Structure 1
């Protein structure tokens, strides 16, 4: 209750469209505290309608859980406004989502960065599992970039709260992430922490291919059919077999045979200490992590919260 602020329409205004997604439309907004004349920039996500007749109460009940997460790699829901539409408010991060970032820096992202992103994403998911929360829609598009050295997972639980209409699960490119889903989730709508591990594997594939679309050209209606016959996402050219084997274990049919998020943290952090042994990238060396000076600059301006330190090289 003390973690979630209930906003009124009178104290915030949408001032710029930022993008649209499977869950709603993102705006750059301004919050005016009562009695003040300043405008604080915020981020606002106006959600699509739900398929269920959800009352406000329990919409607020899931928002209370969204506002209760405390981890450097999980987005905390800061505020909510229940008007005609449901509007979620969080801190504005000028870098956007990680999927767009790797697409904008495809020839300039080094190994140290890619491996550290996989560590931080697994750290966030491991926290969500500790909170016994299942994301259901983990993907690079749902990873937000606070700084290039600090990423955070967002939109956990929005898939279960909003839901998706039955026709989308059998349509092409709908509000259903078929190409990120575990097979048990496609066949029987079973969502666990272990199906999150599957989507984590696809998310890592997204980063290592610098934002390539998974199963591109393959119809979503045939994904369960090709997965049943043993076909998986191909090995990215920069990935050694050690990295590719990790991805393949998250896509195992037996959900309990997939790795745990706490074991994914350990394995990727060991690889981050010696990044050029596990990722082969052209000119990888001159793609350093930032100096102490510049990160101290990044942190003082944009990231005054504390996080783990990014895993350094040998």
Structure 2
């Protein structure tokens, strides 16, 4: 049927890492010292709160399972798990936070070269996920993290599902769903494919190009299916040439097979990234500028395991 999944799940001792401060609430910023390695790895530690919910523990281990099984520079790196009273996910620290907050916060300092490069990197990450027969089902600007302004990674595999040996599509049954990012076939028939992820990519690019605007702002989610069936789509962002907007629009075609492939999105955004001021028009683009003992600090990207 399928290739065996020989990814390694690393179990880490609570004593191997120190929580420096809280990032959200329960994600912490911390440092991880693998036992007798003489390295310090900046980490984000996701620690469950209740700890008495069996449902919560099943969901967290599903995410752990998916994150352990991915290895790509544009997908979030899981370092291991800690089986304390409270299960802790230990991941690469992405110090600039989620790309949605980053584009809202830095709107005035983000040029065309950064935006189109992010489009390429997200497409590479998504192409890698498709190569692994993985459907993300929650691609959004909130689910992309910033290691540096030059380097983003797809995160949040909470909804991610792995197509079967013969499984072209995935069927789901209820919960809180991100309607405004979802392909029409997903909203109507709970059909999810690599092509439904392309729809969500289109919406994510719309978020970046509007510097973090909310899609269909002030429209109820119950309305969204009707609006799309009528042929309405998100509007052309001000900075976007027709070249960039047309690629977004193609991601929102009703025929899933008519949407671009992730591998084609890498190619089209890369051509545009070669000459960014021809494809995005941003006021003052030319002036745009972005970024104890740290002796033994190594980023997770330089920390490789056999």
Q: Deviations over 1:47-73 (max 9, x none)?
A: 589999669799757634422322111
Deviation larger for 1-10 or 96-105: 1-10
CA 200–121 in structure 1, closer or farther in 2 if over 3 Å, else same: same
Contact 1:181–1:195 under 8 Å retained in 2: yes
Summarize the Cα distance change of 1:38–1:273 in structure 2 as closer, same or farther, 3 Å threshold.
closer
TM-score (norm 2): 0.79
- After superposition, give the CA deviation of every residue in 1:192-235 in whole Å (9 maximum; x if it has no partner): 11111010000000100001111111111211121111111111
CA contact (8 A) 2:77 2:300 kept: no
Structure 1 pair 189–244 and aligned structure 2 pair: CA distance change class (3 A): same
Using a 3 Å threshold, how does the CA distance of structure 1 residues 86 and 165 change in structure 2: closer, same or farther? farther
Gap change, CA 1:259 and 1:27, over 3 Å in 2: same
SS in structure 1 opposite 2:214? coil
For residue 161 of structure 1, report the CA deviation from its aligned partner: 10
Work out the number of aligned pairs and report it: 296
RMSD of aligned Cα (Å): 7.0
CA distance in 2, matches of 1:95, 1:9: 25
Report how far residue 282 of structure 1 moved: 0.8
Task: Flag the 1:154–1:219 CA change in 2: closer, same or farther, 3 A.
Answer: same
C-alpha separation in 2, matches of 1:69 and 1:257: 28
Contact 2:98 2:142 (C-alpha < 8 Å) held by counterparts: yes
Seen in structure 2, the aligned counterparts of structure 1 residues 53 and 93 have a Cα distance that, compared at 3 Å, is closer
1:280-306 deviation digits (Å, cap 9, x = unpaired): 111112226889xxxxxxxxxxxxxx9
Q: Aligned equivalents of 1:11 and 1:72: distance in 2?
A: 25
Q: How far apart in 1 are the matches of 2:220 and 2:270?
A: 35
Asked whether the 8 Å contact 1:235–1:244 carries over to 2, the reply is yes
Q: Which moved more, 1:58-67 or 1:116-125?
A: 58-67
**Residues 179 and 256 of structure 1: is their aligned pair in 2 closer, same or farther, counting only changes over 3 Å?**
same
Distance 1:18 1:171, change over 3 A: farther
Q: Secondary structure at the match of 1:54?
A: helix
Counterparts of 1:193 and 1:165, CA distance in 2:
14
Residue aligned with 1:282, SS: coil
Contact 2:110–2:289 at 8 Å: present in 1 too?
Answer: no
- The residue aligned with 1:78 is 79
Gaps of 5+ in 1: 292-305
CA deviation map 1:240-292 (0-9, x unaligned): 1111111011111111111100000000000111111111111112226889x
Write the distance in 2 (CA, Å) between the matches of 1:308 and 1:246.
45
Task: Give yes or no for contact 1:179–1:214 (8 Å, CA) kept in 2.
Answer: yes
The answer to whether the 8 Å contact 2:145/2:153 transfers is: yes
CA distance, structure 1, for counterparts of residue 182 and residue 195 of structure 2: 11
TM-score by length of 1: 0.78
Q: Give the SS at the match of 2:82.
A: strand
Seen in structure 2, the aligned counterparts of structure 1 residues 137 and 312 have a Cα distance that, compared at 3 Å, is closer
| CA shift digits 1:66-100 (9 cap, x unpaired) | 22322111112111134454431112121111111
Mapped partners of 1:311, 1:9: distance in 2: 20
Give the 3 Å change call, closer, same or farther, for CA 157–58 of structure 1 in structure 2: closer
